[PDB]
């Protein structure tokens, strides 16, 4: 039975942070032999083999993300998910000991209440994960007034993708990911990527070409737009995929939402409320490495993109207009 | 139903030295070539009349 | 175990792929060096004849050559395609390919050096290359008499060992065979350059290379033995365009 | 990576290429002419109502081509 | 304008001015010199057939 | 592999009274002017820039904090303090001892702001070396973008009441500014109106904009008539007040107007960055009984 | 760990003329297009967007500069250029040879800008290969802003002309400089101005009334060192808006929106990628810094 | 493989269709065409090889 305990002697002492490089001076120049991962040009031969390069593969960078542990009502977080969705932590007031509220982008489409033609795919899918929209509106009574003065983009803190979720009847545990690549729980040695519905994502770089430079980086941006439909305030969340840098995309997002700016601001020739002037916000959901192909999927149908090698790095909310 | 075989290509490598192209060249193994800046060969041609 | 040992097979086959995609780099760039220094026939052929350059390149002699660059391109280009529609046929290719052969300036410092040889000690002159479609054409019209050649088995070394390293660190130059160069000036002076003695110094270690048995195709053209190689197998197995097709 | 030093030993020319065998004509020798409206789009006539008329009498637009890759002609 | 020995050396290694594209629908000019292998004997001879 | 530790030595030993105040905050976030491990006392507070003899600043502190390196206390030993180094994107632990006490919750974004409150809440005076260390005002970002705003409004109406009594009511001013509502809770801040010299520079900048912005935007609308005008700017003519559009721009000359427009933009980028970007960090876990919040620092 | 090295193949032997300028700038930052070891010379220059016969537009060139990766030279061999790479976030040596010289120190901040003073000085042409190479300029962040402040003002006052001492001169403590404007394409520099007309007239609508009444109490008698812009006379507009009575909870809603739109003016006055220098040597002209992400 | 070495573009397919016409008209019923040619047996052999 100690052979099972001898396994934890191997794995725990094998998996540690690397210790500090500290060698006493009386030993001499032995410390230069203790520097291996800074060496990055390994010698090759006529016929190289793994036994020639098993030392070369042994140095690897130090990557460990920081997880988030959320305790959620089983009503808000729909019990079946594709295990890689994006999340949000909505926060109003600590009323309970530990109860937390989490919003998938299919769920935030239900609290929005926009027309069907803006997102013609997810409206059927998000209509069967939930009720008619009052199952989630009972928890936030201020959804009329949080849209008027425009405080809703100040109450969302972007979290990242899922990792694990153990589901019970009343209480659902959600294990999320921050800082980067979350380790997959059920499949060993796998990595959970970030999945978006194809309807919500709006690509930005698209050309005939009719040339743009390459890079290492492309940054997914979140967006959230205050608007009015049926003379009732409602929100609209879209995503962006671009590597243009922050100085361009703010001008590019204005060209996407041109009509939404125009149809709203016809109203304020009559009534000019300073609380109404706030329009939208843009966060930074973290970087994606270049030339990774987003792979289409199909779920139930619902087409869902996927991003391998996603890493998360949350940012502030800045008010664009 | 049944598997009837797994058939796989094998890439036979072709050395430059054992092509007959290499008769058009003179091949010298040179160890440290990143160290060299420039090579230079000098000809001296006498011409009688 | 079979997941581990099935993982060590993948990484070697990814890394044997690493070296053998670089050995194609040799055969690419060496063939790319040749094509930068390979002018066509119709330019080089009339420069091959010295009878026009005896009088010098005057104003009129340049003009008379231009009409022979013109006339050779109109008639003798696509020379293997015209041969099917001529009554003469097989002799017309054999003259024109040999007229290509004698136009090449073969002036080489290593001409006395013993290099790639046929069976029975006869001497390889040079190597022509075709595509696969032209290779079977020239194989039908011309016999492949030996289909065997000898050659070097390995490369030759050149190390900066010895007194070469003294001039490499202190100064900025590295002498080609400094020990062979030192004895000519200070140790054995005032000797005129004699070819049969200079050749041992001109061999530069290409003698004492172990000979071997190389399998390739040969052909007999006049007094010269030529080897024939078509490189589409090293290009169309990797699905890249060939530089021979222009 | 691997680095190569390649020199040229011969004084005279040592390599000769040649045209050998015709395989295909891709030009198709078509009698389409080049449209100078595309090269110089900025220069136009003074009356912009009339310049849209002559442009109507001349003219990606081809989805397919039968005989081969089409070739432009000029006018001197 | 220079000597013809230099023009022979410049004929093979220097793809000269204004070339035409290949394998694409109309006659475009090629600016990407990575692949195109065309040899045009129309500059040195200064003719048109 | 990498080692990080910041050990500050002193010249004189500490008193027995001053040791209990540093043991009060054994976890904190100090700014630190150098990256090396051995260092003198004069950089680890805000005493290098802010002092009693110098005039109190806001902006030159806010220029300083984004340029400065942060550090966290681990153990206080007399006399040699032991700080720990902050790395870009590193996970470490913070105890939250800052006066006055604002409540931290998990999944909030921590925003380091300079202290603009009273002295004894902010600093701990070291009598042995005669140098003042100053702990920064660590406040969550949505408060930190609101706790500055109502005070900066309060500083303006203090300048109006001192110039003319009839325009500002104190009961209207006090009840609406010093009471801050956030997360459903309230916070009654210390006003310190006993004599707010910290926010005098921001009270100068926002006002100089407020006269020059409506003077500025009239000329910038009329100068940009095109066939290639961006179509959203046709809408925003309805947003500007009608009194703004009636400026006679003939009154200011051309050599005056180039000075205005360069003054127009040069305040804007100097004022935007000092509201926006400072050393700002995240927290993913919190416990109220232990008062320990696991954090991670995101530069820029 | 990670390697960073770009060695540039080049098809012709460089002359001794052009090698002497490249030997002069051995420590320099130039952007390039792709992320590989081997690279053609047509990506090394910044001049794929800024050529001679093309009229340059320095906003679009600066817009170009945030996309690309940045690289530092190691050696200039007479055939191959050899460079090292900059990735966020990595510490590296940087050495300023940049010709309109400014002085740095430890704990300074930087930015990368297109050449805005002398193009002929800061660009060398390669007659051997026919392709020219354009070098950007590294600037401390205060003058990194203050040059872009003048260039936005300039395209405002070239359109009204449809003289030069006020529009083309970037001011700084101790020195004045000349911007290089002979051929500028304004259309990408005017879309930035098109968004400035959006933000600035919204900020003229939500103006705090008390902060207007503060200047009516200030600039008439209380003269300060940084209020010399108004020269002692109130503008005519400011007397018109202050007819309303003051109330606190009007301005509380206003000043938060004034606050929230000055968050947006970061996005229009952005520089390139920034460089926070921690240690700078003086006599060696070397430095050390970590490259920031965009 | 000399034809489709670029990839089946729109310019290659029309070259590959225009050779379907020119080979079906010229070389079809090749044993019937060889009953009247001067060469004869060479036309059958260079067709069948």
From Swiss-Prot, chain B:
Compartments, as annotated in UniProt: Virion; Host nucleus
Coiled coil: none
Domain of life of the organism encoding this protein: Viruses
Known role: Self-assembles to form an icosahedral capsid with a T=16 symmetry, about 200 nm in diameter, and consisting of 150 hexons and 12 pentons (total of 162 capsomers). Hexons form the edges and faces of the capsid and are each composed of six MCP molecules. In contrast, one penton is found at each of the 12 vertices. Eleven of the pentons are MCP pentamers, while the last vertex is occupied by the portal complex.
Subunit structure: Homomultimer. Makes the hexons and eleven out of twelve pentons. Interacts with triplex proteins 1/TRX1 and 2/TRX2; adjacent capsomers are linked together in groups of three by triplexes, heterotrimeric complexes composed of one molecule of TRX1 and two molecules of TRX2. Interacts with scaffold protein; this interaction allows efficient MCP transport to the host nucleus. Interacts with capsid vertex component 2/CVC2. Interacts with the small capsomere-interacting protein/SCP.
Family, similarity comment: Belongs to the herpesviridae major capsid protein family.
Identification of the protein by name: Major capsid protein
Organism: Human herpesvirus 8 type P (isolate GK18) (HHV-8)
Part of the whole protein covered: 51 to 99 of 1376
From Swiss-Prot, chain E:
Subcellular location field: Virion; Host nucleus
Residues of the full protein shown: 1279 to 1327 of 1376
Function: Self-assembles to form an icosahedral capsid with a T=16 symmetry, about 200 nm in diameter, and consisting of 150 hexons and 12 pentons (total of 162 capsomers). Hexons form the edges and faces of the capsid and are each composed of six MCP molecules. In contrast, one penton is found at each of the 12 vertices. Eleven of the pentons are MCP pentamers, while the last vertex is occupied by the portal complex.
Family listed: Belongs to the herpesviridae major capsid protein family.
Protein name (Swiss-Prot/TrEMBL): Major capsid protein
Classification lineage: Viruses, Duplodnaviria, Heunggongvirae, Peploviricota, Herviviricetes
Assembly and interaction partners: Homomultimer. Makes the hexons and eleven out of twelve pentons. Interacts with triplex proteins 1/TRX1 and 2/TRX2; adjacent capsomers are linked together in groups of three by triplexes, heterotrimeric complexes composed of one molecule of TRX1 and two molecules of TRX2. Interacts with scaffold protein; this interaction allows efficient MCP transport to the host nucleus. Interacts with capsid vertex component 2/CVC2. Interacts with the small capsomere-interacting protein/SCP.
